[PDB]
Each structure stands twice: as structure tokens, then as C-alpha cells.
Amino acid sequence: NIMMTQSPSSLAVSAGEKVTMNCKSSQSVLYSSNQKNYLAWYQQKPGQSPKLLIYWASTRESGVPDRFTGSGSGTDFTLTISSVQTEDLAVYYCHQYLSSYMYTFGGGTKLEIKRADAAPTVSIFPPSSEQLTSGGASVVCFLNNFYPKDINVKWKIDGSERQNGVLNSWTDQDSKDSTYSMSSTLTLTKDEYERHNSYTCEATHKTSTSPIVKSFNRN
Amino acid sequence: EVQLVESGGDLVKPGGSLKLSCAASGFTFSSYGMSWVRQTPDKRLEWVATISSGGNYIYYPDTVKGRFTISRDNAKNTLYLQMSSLKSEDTAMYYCTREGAYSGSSSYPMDYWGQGTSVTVSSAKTTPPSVYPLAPGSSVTLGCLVKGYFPESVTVTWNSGSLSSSVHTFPALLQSGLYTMSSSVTVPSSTWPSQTVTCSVAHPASSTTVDKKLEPSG
């Protein structure tokens, strides 16, 4: 088995900058009879299947832009993007297709787009009527359109920070603005919810030394 | 125009069987070898099986050999994957690929990939979701909380697709052996609540479509 190793696992790059991603095979993928490297590069854009970019380690596929360049021989290979475009946001995988061997893929390099720092737009939502009707009570916080991905959310119930029953989910980078979004959900029973009055969610982000605070009272 | 259309993906109990199909068009299907490649939740790409142009030569990795069967029908322009003794580690997006090299001759890697069919191998039962509107208690953020469904996926649309470039779909998380996800829309203060905003949730797995109108409070 030829092990394909890709480095780095992910990298952030601004539009118009040069990008280099590495691939390493556990053994030579150079043929010697052909004198060709049986290495391919695929690009997988969000929500899509992979698309072939490079074959024979250096030759570009049909509709592949000139900015994409493959190099290396034997065990060490690289994929280079000369003028990074927002459209080039994808996971890039290397693949060995050596005749006598089982097909293998690298773990992929996630290329993320660097943008200006942006603060989140915070929104708080009390449990719905129909949810309370069923015995449950979920308080939701949306932290929308922020950059970078690192953010902290603390939930406060009547001034006390709560650390039981919260689930946080991040969106992938936007196709249009390169930002992230996150949804934080505090789940309590209808009884636990009715026992308290003030519900607060505080967001801390690189953009401000001050938390963005959103709250509501059950009245 | 090369087109590879997979179908057959479903929720299967561990130890079960499932047959995947791939309808090919826009190329002489019978002159190419086809392959199946799966993508697991960790996003890793894993070669599953390959069959020569004619269906004479078959190749499998150790992970699948004995359990899976690749086949094709050159008269129907279809590729098949019969899966049996299914295990949870078989849960993935299954792609139908086309071997780049013409017939026997080597040197060209797989070039066209289809859109995939997802296969879930789990002892967990199909549960329809509960949809809860998220309304506040220049712009206004509205949402929908879609809780306690199995399996993935659900499809949330706002105003039946009329809304918007301003939608966020938050990836589902497994909570108590069931999935929970959320969606948000941002509309101008002038449009809501003056004009009707509804989220439509469909879970094809449970044959469920649920439309929730978002209403103001106080």
C-alpha cells in the first residue's frame, strides 16, 4: 500500500497570493519504463464532487486555469496556485494510480480564503410555543458573518454561566463573503426554563475587547 | 457532456444489503472502466471497486473484498454496486467515477465523478424532525430549529427558495442518537412581519415536508 501524505492539513491565503501544497508518497510513483509519475491532483469545491486538475504530476487537465501548476518526482510532489482566487476555495487531494497497485488518496489540504476581520451579528431567540408544548425549551443564538473562525460563546441564566446542554455549530466559509457563522443552542426542559427569567448569550471575538451581549426576559 | 448519476443510497441496518446504481451518458460507456470511490464523514477519499470496460476484470481493496460486488450493464449504460454485510464504517458518500484510460491501456487517472449517493449504516430508526420557528422575543434575523430527526439529511428552504443570498444552514450535530440543525435568514425590517416569511423543511428519509410560518411576538 502506497500511503499518500498531504501537508499542511489546511492553509489560509489572501486573494492574489501564491499557494504551495505538498504531497508525499510512502514509495516512488515514478514508472521508469514510462519515465512518468503516476500522481494526480483533484479539487473538491464545497457541495461538489472532485474535479481532476493535474495528471502525470505536471500536466493540466482540459479546462484547468494556467495558475494551477504541479511539480515534483518520485515521492515528493507539490501543487501551486500562482494568483489565488476566491473560487479556488476547495480541498485539494493527491492520488496515486500506479498500475500494479491499489488506488490511494492523500488526506487533502483545505485551502481557506483570508479576508478582513469582521465582527459577528448576534441574535437571540426564546423557545417557541410549540416546543414548550412538547416539554422542551431551546434558546438559540446566531453569531453571523464573522472572520476569523475563532469565537467564544457563554450562556448566562439569571447572571450565572451555564455549561450543561449547549451545542455549537459552525457554517463553512461563505462563497460570497468568506465569513463564518455559528449557531449556539442551549437546551433545557420546560420546567428548568420556567424556573428562571433572564437568558443571555455573550460572544467574544478578536474584533473587540468587549463581548457582544444579547438577552431576553420571560416578560 | 459526460454525466454520471448515482442512485440507491439509503439508511441500512448493520449486516444488511443495498444496491447502488450509476446512470452514465455523454460518452461510449462500454469503452471505459468504471470505479466507485467513497468519501467518509472525515472527508477522506477511499477507492471501493473497479471493473474493466467489458466487465471481465474486477479489482477490490481489502476493506471491501468479499462483502461488495461491482458490476455493469453495457446495454443499459449502468454501473452497479451490490453491498452486503454492511457495517457502520461503510457510511459515506459513494461516487461513481470513470477511468480516464481507453479500455486496457494504462497512464490516465479517473477524470469524471458523479454527484454521489449517501449511504448510512446504522441501527438507529428513521425519525421525522420537529420544526420550531425562531422569531425575536434595518435588518431582522429569523430562523428555524429542526430537532430530533434521523437519518441525515434535511433540506431547509426559505419562502420556497425565493429567500435568499442571506440564508445560513448550520451543519447537523448528533444529540442523544438524533440529529439537530438550524437555519437563519436576514430580511429588511420593512419586509417582516409586513410580508410572510416561512421555512420549509423536508426530510425525504421519513417522507416529511413541514412548512413553518414565522410569526411575531407581543
Of the candidates B104, B124, B144, which is a domain's last residue? B124
Segments forming the whole domain that contains residue A87: 1-115
Per CB-CB distance under 8 Å, the chain B contacts of A56 are 107
Q: Would you say A13 and A88 are in contact if contact means Cβ atoms under 8 Å apart?
A: no
| Mutant choice from B42, B62, B107, B152 vs A, greatest count of A C-beta within 10 A | B107
Domain count, chain A: 2
Q: Would you say B141 and A145 are in contact if contact means Cβ atoms under 8 Å apart?
A: no
Per CB-CB distance under 8 Å, the chain A contacts of B95 are 49-50
Residue A219 lies in a domain: no
The verdict on B113 and B130 lying in the same domain is no
The answer to whether A128 contacts B145, with C-beta atoms less than 8 Å apart, is: yes
The verdict on B19 and B47 lying in the same domain is yes
Segments forming the whole domain that contains residue B110: 1-124
Residue B81 to chain A, least CA–CA distance (Å): 18
Residue carrying C-alpha cell 464523514: B41
Domain count, chain B: 2
Run of H or E residues at A123: strand A121-125
Of the candidates A59, A81, A115, which is a domain's last residue? A115
Q: What is the DSSP string of chain B?
A: --EEEEE---EE-TT--EEEEEEEESS-GGGS-EEEEEE-TT--EEEEEEE-TTS--EE--TTTTTTEEEEEETTTTEEEEEE-S--GGG-EEEEEEE-SS-TT--S----EE---EEEEE-SPPPB--EEEEE----EEEEEEEEEEEBSS--EEEEGGGTB-TTEEEEEEEEETTEEEEEEEEEEETTTTTTS--EEEEEEGGGTEEEEEE-----
Does A146 reach chain B within 8 Å, measured CB to CB? no
The verdict on B78 and B159 lying in the same domain is no
Of A51, A103, A167, the CB nearest to B175: A167
The verdict on A138 and A207 lying in the same domain is yes
The verdict on B24 and B105 lying in the same domain is yes
The verdict on A3 and A106 lying in the same domain is yes
**Alpha carbon of A45 to those of A95, A127, B39, B92: distances in Å?**
17, 36, 14, 18
Which of A111, A88, A78 shows the shortest CA–CA distance to A11? A111
Q: For position A20, which CATH number holds? A: 2.60.40.10
Does A120 reach chain B within 8 Å, measured CB to CB? no
The verdict on B48 and B103 lying in the same domain is yes
Residue A79 to chain B, least CA–CA distance (Å): 17
Per CB-CB distance under 8 Å, the chain B contacts of A93 are 45
The verdict on A128 and A150 lying in the same domain is yes
The verdict on B114 and B6 lying in the same domain is yes
Of the candidates A94, A115, A136, which is a domain's last residue? A115
The answer to whether A170 contacts B116, with C-beta atoms less than 8 Å apart, is: no
The verdict on A100 and A120 lying in the same domain is no
Residue B131 to chain A, least CA–CA distance (Å): 9
The verdict on A144 and A199 lying in the same domain is yes
The verdict on A37 and A100 lying in the same domain is yes
Of the candidates A89, A115, A141, which is a domain's last residue? A115
The verdict on A65 and A97 lying in the same domain is yes
